Amino acid sequence: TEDMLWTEKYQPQTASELIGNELAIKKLHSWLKDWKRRAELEERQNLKGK
Amino acid sequence: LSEFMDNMSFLDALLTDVREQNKYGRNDFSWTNGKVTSGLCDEFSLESN
Amino acid sequence: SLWVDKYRPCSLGRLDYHKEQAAQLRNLVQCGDFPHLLVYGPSGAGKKTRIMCILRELYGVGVEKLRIEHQTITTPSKKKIEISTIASNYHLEVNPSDAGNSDRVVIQEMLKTVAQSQQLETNSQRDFKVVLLTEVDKLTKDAQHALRRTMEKYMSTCRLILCCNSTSKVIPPIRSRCLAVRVPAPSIEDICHVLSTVCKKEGLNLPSQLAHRLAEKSCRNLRKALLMCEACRVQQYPFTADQEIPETDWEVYLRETANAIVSQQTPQRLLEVRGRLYELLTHCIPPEIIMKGLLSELLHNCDGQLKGEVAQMAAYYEHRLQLGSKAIYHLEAFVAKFMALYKKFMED
Amino acid sequence: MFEARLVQGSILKKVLEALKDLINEACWDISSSGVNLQSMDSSHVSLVQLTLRSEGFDTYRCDRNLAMGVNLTSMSKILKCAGNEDIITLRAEDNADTLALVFEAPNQEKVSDYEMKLMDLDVEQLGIPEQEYSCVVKMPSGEFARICRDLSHIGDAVVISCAKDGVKFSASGELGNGNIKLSQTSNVDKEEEAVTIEMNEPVQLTFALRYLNFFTKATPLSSTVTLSMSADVPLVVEYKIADMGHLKYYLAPKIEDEEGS
Amino acid sequence: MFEARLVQGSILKKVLEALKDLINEACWDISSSGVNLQSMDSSHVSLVQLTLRSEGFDTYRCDRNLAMGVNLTSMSKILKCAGNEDIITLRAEDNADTLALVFEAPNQEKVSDYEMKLMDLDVEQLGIPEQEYSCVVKMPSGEFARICRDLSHIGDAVVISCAKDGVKFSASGELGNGNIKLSQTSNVDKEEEAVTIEMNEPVQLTFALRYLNFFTKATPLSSTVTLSMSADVPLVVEYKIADMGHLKYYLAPKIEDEEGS
Amino acid sequence: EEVDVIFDEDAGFLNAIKTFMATTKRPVILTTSDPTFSLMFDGCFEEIKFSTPSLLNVASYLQMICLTENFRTDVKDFVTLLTANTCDIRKSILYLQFWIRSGGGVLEERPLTLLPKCDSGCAETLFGLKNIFSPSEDLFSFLKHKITMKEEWHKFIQLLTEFQ
Amino acid sequence: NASSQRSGRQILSQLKEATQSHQVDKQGVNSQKPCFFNS
Amino acid sequence: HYELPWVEKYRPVKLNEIVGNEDTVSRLEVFAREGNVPNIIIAGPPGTGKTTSILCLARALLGPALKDAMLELNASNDRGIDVVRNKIKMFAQQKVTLPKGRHKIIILDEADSMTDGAQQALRRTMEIYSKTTRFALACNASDKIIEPIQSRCAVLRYTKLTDAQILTRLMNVIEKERVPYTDDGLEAIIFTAQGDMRQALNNLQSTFSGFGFINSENVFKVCDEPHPLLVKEMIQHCVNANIDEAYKILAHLWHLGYSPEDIIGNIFRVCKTFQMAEYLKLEFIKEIGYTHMKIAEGVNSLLQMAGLLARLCQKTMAP
Amino acid sequence: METSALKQQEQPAATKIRNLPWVEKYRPQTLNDLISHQDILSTIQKFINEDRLPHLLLYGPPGTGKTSTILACAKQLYKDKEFGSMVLELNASDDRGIDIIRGPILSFASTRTIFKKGFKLVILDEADAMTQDAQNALRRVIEKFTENTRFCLICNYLSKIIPALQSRCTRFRFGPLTPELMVPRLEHVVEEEKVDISEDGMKALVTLSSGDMRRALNILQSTNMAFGKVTEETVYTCTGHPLKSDIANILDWMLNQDFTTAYRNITELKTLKGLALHDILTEIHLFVHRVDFPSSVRIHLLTKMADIEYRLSVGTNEKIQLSSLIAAFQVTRDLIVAE
Ligand SMILES: Nc1ncnc2c1ncn2[C@@H]1O[C@H](COP(=O)(O)OP(=O)(O)OP(O)(O)=S)[C@@H](O)[C@H]1O
Ligand SMILES: Nc1ncnc2c1ncn2[C@@H]1O[C@H](COP(=O)(O)OP(=O)(O)OP(O)(O)=S)[C@@H](O)[C@H]1O
Ligand SMILES: Nc1ncnc2c1ncn2[C@@H]1O[C@H](COP(=O)(O)OP(=O)(O)O)[C@@H](O)[C@H]1O
Ligand SMILES: [Mg+2]
Ligand SMILES: [Mg+2]
């Protein structure tokens, strides 16, 4: 009855579900946090301009 | 045990192996290279194996 | 920058030993049409520094700067191989033995690019670029045939320098067209001279007894002597005549391996000796060096009639090691046959 | 069962020539109300909203709301053979893997039954809802494309700044500076050439030109165009065809790395 | 001793560009009635036959039958620098292995001359009996190239059928099956040609794209084409050139197998 | 994804991604498995290296995966599978899916407190050794006993040549 | 990815505006994966 | 009217008609009965039933939808870099209405012949479109398939067919073809096909067409290997340390025109099942392997084979 | 492309006033003319005449009559009015990679006949030169078009063909001829050409050619124009083969006198006759089984000589290997004689 592979059935949707390499996923998650912060700062600056 | 492992050295040295060992790098436990990436070109090998 | 390369001579006049050979190489350079060189001799003899002196005599001071470049060559079996390379404006240095049986995939191609550069680069100094070939004794039969055809094809284009330790594996065709430069190991007094000169240039003084002990422990290896002198400098600020020269760690590990082989002859001890040899192999120690060290440390405990049989067995299994691929089989096969023979000798 | 009969397919050929390089795939969201084509480009910065009324066809029939995704390059392949005076039929089964297009040549009997496999989109209609735009500008199409041509000769980033008199186009390039202004030409003979401004508050944005080239490659489809621009919303470029539907085109403005004080 | 006087360089230009990559060599055999050229593709799937009458040349004169075989790489390279409107002459010896092509002056100031070698091949007379064909149609030439380009750019093999309505071209490619039907009453206005049939029994076959497109490469030789098909007798496309003489192509259909259970 | 894979049709891809590198305002990720590319590519990028994960952690993760699918397994079989697959998580997950949805390995009972029957034997069928042996035959039980009859001699030969 | 045609002018002219500009659809169905290609 | 080959005439149509590799065939059977098969790579020797198993699996999974939901690409097709990037990718993105648990199948037969760049492009397009499409690869040497392709699939292993299974299928074909036979001809057909079912069927059909009866002399007349009776007699002479008679047989084989390669191959194949002691068999196999390596390196003369017989004689004559 | 005008020009090519093409003088035209492999040509006729011709794999040592045989079958099956349209003869001489399989062969096999309806045939010469993946494509082409076209693969060594290609075809080995039946043909050509050969020269011709007709004609013709008469010394000197007297004297030196004198004599003879150690080893090995040795002596000599021949292959010093060859006899047979 199932129709997808287990690699995408049990695909980690949240970064904490990655097994091992916790320093690497910590660095990547942190770096994307600064990039999302910069995107939100750009949006805030755009709305403050107008 | 010594006779068996002499026979195994006989097999490793004096018999043909299926996959040609140290084909692109040298033997095991080497530091100089070992980063043999696979092929990246669409032309065929045209080898005489 | 240790003492081995900080005080490496740069010209043929600053060499301390083989001075007649240095003058002969200078006269070779001054003729203007020096041939392919086949430099050979033991390790630590001084082949590389003499080749560097030859290169500095040929071209200007610009060979003293070096740069590392990586070359990715496509194999005819369509699997690209990337190798490192030390080079300069005037010379190239390569070690194609790192490419396994694809060493010819370097040899037929790499020097060709240099030949391409010889029709691309123009300097009006000399009509060739020197290609240095390190560990040419480790090439295969077809690699050496490729090298032969390569020096035939680009004779007037580039010159070849082949540095090796043994000319046994190289083919007689590759020797029939290269001038042979045999660099023997320096004597004990020569190593003492070099050690005293290197210590004086650093500002220290070492006694003649310590220098003689270092030269005797080096086994006529100048580089090993310099490294051991630097280690003795690290251990003690002044050089005393009774200062203990520190020993090589893998050498003493091989010595305890030989003692464990001699002490008990059991399958359990055979397994621990196999584990020790695996530990040495994982340290990138070459298996031929391990076999030579094992034979050197096992012949002390042997008896006179046993010595010839043990040496012949070690040579047999080292030839098997050369023929095969997984060297632990031949190493431990020699080991186990030695324990069997030694046990049979000790029961009678 | 979906069945549509474009009485004339010159406008279909010219709109696929307008959208031949921008969007990767085209979806049909086909209902009883009409035919919807909401397509997002490969860069996901622009959007195309092509809407065809049911009365704009000869016969239009749709039993159930359906959606198909085909690719643009195959549509470029089929529609090269389309003439300018010809009848075009679009046919689809109720639950089909394929879409048919019947091209009836002006000969007595020369039929091109051109069939094309669907390509299985996982994306539905995606667009902003109706919201009141501060600046609404009616302005001709040919001189829009002419302005885009000269400014694309000038530079690679424009500032669009609405004003009381019109809307100013500014650009700074390495060749020079290109600035153009728009004035009211409402007191003119043709209503297409007439320019009227319904601007409410002054906004300004930074845009990309090649996008304006695909924007304005839809030139001869409509006489005049309507620009809707407000605060922090995509530019809406609106072409209303006569009793034959209308198309909206959406630009997302370039981001600005604003510096603090 | 063979001499031929080709009236227009366009005829030899288009004949050489027709057989450009279909064939490996050309072996012309001369006769009192005219000159002939029959040979076959290196893949042994297509036959090219070409007959030129004596009266078509201005001065055609021969002594005895002789066949000359030239590889067409050299002669195509030579003939690519020939005038379209110019008048050409061909001359060969009785036993020498060199053939001379002399092009007259295109600028009325430089007569061009060139020579090719000769290589002998096993080219025997493929004596096909001309069986009565069950499907003979007449159809425009440029239209045939257009339709073959439309079909061959989607799929790999073109299915050609000849039913009671007329001819039918189909291609079930990986993109989607394209299909155009032509009829008896369908007469085009581009060349003012009407599709007519002389068919007895309907036959349906399938062919490769490349050889059919190479057949279409000989478009401007005639205003009309006769297509000839039968249940066994293979695909024939034939061009009846102005005056007399004709160009004749045989293509072998692919083998079609029934699907398994 | 897979920046080290450069074809002749991908003309100037390295120059294009360098032009991307210079003139971007949004984050860019490069994913590769060739270790040389980080030395070959020129430009400023933050290096992130995924080391090989611990065998016990991925073994317990696959134990979780099989436990959710109502399958009970031992950690030793998973350790063998991951050692054979050199700790490839995707390859292990895919082979586990194939082997579970086929009906598991063999019905054997093992009492562990540390209950349905356990399902050891995944690494045996991973190498295709179940295609040679009867399903009542263990590999080590086959190796320990002496071999006399021709058929299991052929079984031994087939085992060794499949591993050779 | 390597499964699609990525030549330099192709990826430039079709993906610079993703980095240099905003997204037209900011709300709704956004966290998807459009794999860039041009058949 | 046309004579179909018995290889194709008696091809299995159902997955339960496939002998050998019972575990993997049964797993494929339950996947065909259930559905949701993952991406698989079937590796093994030729003639063992990999293409047949994949075709029967796809047939059972699809049925009437096999005509449009299946894309097969063998080594006779292009399967280039542009083919992988275009044709396979549009078939992967193609919409096909299928029952639940059924996916489109992309069979890539002879994935060894697939170019490395084609596989490198195949990686991601096999990974992402797995919700609607599946990949079934078949190969002989799995080492020729690059590592990410093996990582994105499930590797299934096929082995050589046991002579019992080849005998059962041979009896199945014989009892549906009115083939007169004897036991020695069956042993000869099984010997001439070492673990191959295609070679067994082809040799059976060739012997039936050439002579009409299945005995050993007919099989070895139509197949023309060095006769296993001669090689067995030579090995028996070497066991008794009779260099003269063993060399007489070897020189007779050499003057019959047999190459060194098939002579040493038949020597190994006969010696594998020869009835002698284990130590003598081990020394014989070691010396045969050394001589076979010497033949493969390039030195292949009667001196090499005479030196082997002699190294085989001195194995027994000396302790 | 091309590579066909040379053969067509070569077939009626002779000076016809001075040249003597002895090999091309006596060629069979049909299967009733090639008096060799009667079982093979009979079963080929039995396959063709009843419309059950399978895929054929013709192999064997070269010069045994394979290409002309299949040319005779192709000409007797298909008339000249339809021969080129439905018989496609290619080889590995025209190789640009593997394109020939997906090009001419795949196009030819996948289409029907043009003029006369029937089955087509592909001749493929030196098929062992193909790569493994080219054969993997060819077997698929053969498998899916087996009803329309049949294939005939002519190779030299069967070991270079993949097992599936061998599985699709029935194999025919063209072995060397029993040296006896070759003699009638040699008496025929000497009676035609009026030459002087003794029986010993006949023995030399049948032992040098190893069942090859063309090489026998070449050697006989060359020795005839060189000397005008053929005895064993005359053919062996023109051939440059180790003479039986020289090998017998080498064996006598290695059996009779000491190490140094035999070594010097053998080195002198090798430099004198241009003799290599490989051919010395071959002829001495042939001499070993015709000389009455004990079984242990024969085993020792064969093992040692095989080891020396292996050592010569890797490129060692030929002088030291010659000393080892002398040593192999000095170990056993000299002290057996002196006992
Ligand atoms: N296990 C089997 N059971 C029954 N018949 C078989 C079996 N294996 C092979 N055959 C027969 O042999 C023919 C060829 O089998 P294939 O499946 O084509 O071999 P293969 O596994 O594809 O190996 P290749 O193609 O050389 S890599 C089939 O059509 C069957 O008639
Ligand atoms: N048994 C034979 N008796 C007489 N002449 C023979 C015999 N075998 C070959 N020939 C001659 O060899 C010629 C060519 O035969 P081919 O079939 O071409 O030989 P082949 O076995 O195919 O090996 P090739 O062609 O050299 S690779 C014939 O025309 C004969 O003159
Ligand atoms: N004439 C010399 N004077 C001083 N030091 C030397 C002299 N010759 C060699 N050396 C030292 O000995 C070492 C020799 O190493 P190298 O040139 O690599 O020889 P090899 O290649 O034989 O190992 C160098 O490190 C160098 O510093
Ligand atoms: Mg198969
Ligand atoms: Mg031949």
Side-chain angles (χ1 to χ4, degrees), chain I residues 283-322:
Chain I
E283 296 296 316
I284 283 291
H285 159 251
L286 285 192
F287 260 78
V288 152
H289 297 104
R290 310 165 36 225
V291 167
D292 205 300
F293 288 136
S295 286
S296 47
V297 176
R298 190 121 53 192
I299 283 156
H300 185 278
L301 286 177
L302 287 187
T303 295
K304 289 309 178 61
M305 280 178 341
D307 274 349
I308 300 162
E309 188 208 42
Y310 180 42
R311 284 192 234 117
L312 279 175
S313 86
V314 79
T316 46
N317 204 13
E318 157 150 21
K319 186 168 52 82
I320 315 181
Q321 307 304 318
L322 175 61

Side-chain angles (χ1 to χ4, degrees), chain A residues 38 42 45-47 49-50, chain D residues 204-205 232 256-258:
Chain A
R38 291 268 316 282
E42 284 159 351
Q45 277 156 9
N46 290 318
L47 193 54
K50 299 157 196 171
Chain D
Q204 73 293 30
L205 284 173
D232 54 46
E256 317 266 45
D257 308 3
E258 304 201 8

